[PDB]
């Protein structure tokens, strides 16, 4: 099944970030499997509507994953 | 598209009822308030199924409930 | 314990609405024991920062509970 | 009190993130009050030694906050 905005809106607010995480994790894992768990947790801070867009836009998710990777990188 | 009824919804599990009502409500709410659509939909899905079925056939009533939900979401 | 914005921010995003719900429910139940579960669920749609303010301000919580009660009220024919 | 690496190291791992969060949050809130909670949660995924450096380097905290803000920025 594909997570729609109506299906997410129908779920209790307590379960929405969990549901988005479950779908985000395999996609992030297909790009950067080593930091996927950490990156997933970070990207879950993004508003739910933007996360639903990212679940359907591979290049938008890619650029956010790359931005999260840069956030984790320590100073030179 | 079929008219949803209280008896037809009562036959399905409670979360499935909310999903069915949510699928009809979300596109209409998004047409009014696209930014808060997901939040408004989630909120309005707490209303009794019979009142929700009325609102799905009464654009005037849906709009006033959406405006009431928007007031609830407004910060102080 | 009182839920601070820093304590909520340190929790995983998957747990934040659940944590806010656990704090909101007893307070809502105290002024509206009837549809407390529904009101809590509705108010959890509000942004987390505004919910943290509402947990500290009884003023804003009561008015939001009253507004939620109005949303639940069925139309008069 | 000033948070030293030895003081942080003496506490359990999750207690360490909460302690760093308590120091990071007011500084991040001063910069971006609306996104403070989200930015703090995301920056807490960074290694504790790099977080302690950022708490003592206002310029490096600012550049990390800006990177986190870009991660949160919606496509529209
Ligand atoms: Cl809007
Ligand atoms: Cl801000």
UniProtKB/Swiss-Prot annotation, chain B:
It is found in: Cytoplasm. It comes from Homo sapiens (Human). It comes from the Eukaryota. Residues 1-76 form the PABC domain. Binds the poly(A) tail of mRNA. May be involved in cytoplasmic regulatory processes of mRNA metabolism. Binds poly(A) with a slightly lower affinity as compared to PABPC1. The chain holds residues 537 to 612 of 631 of the full protein. The gene is PABPC3. This is Polyadenylate-binding protein 3. Belongs to the polyadenylate-binding protein type-1 family. Testis specific.
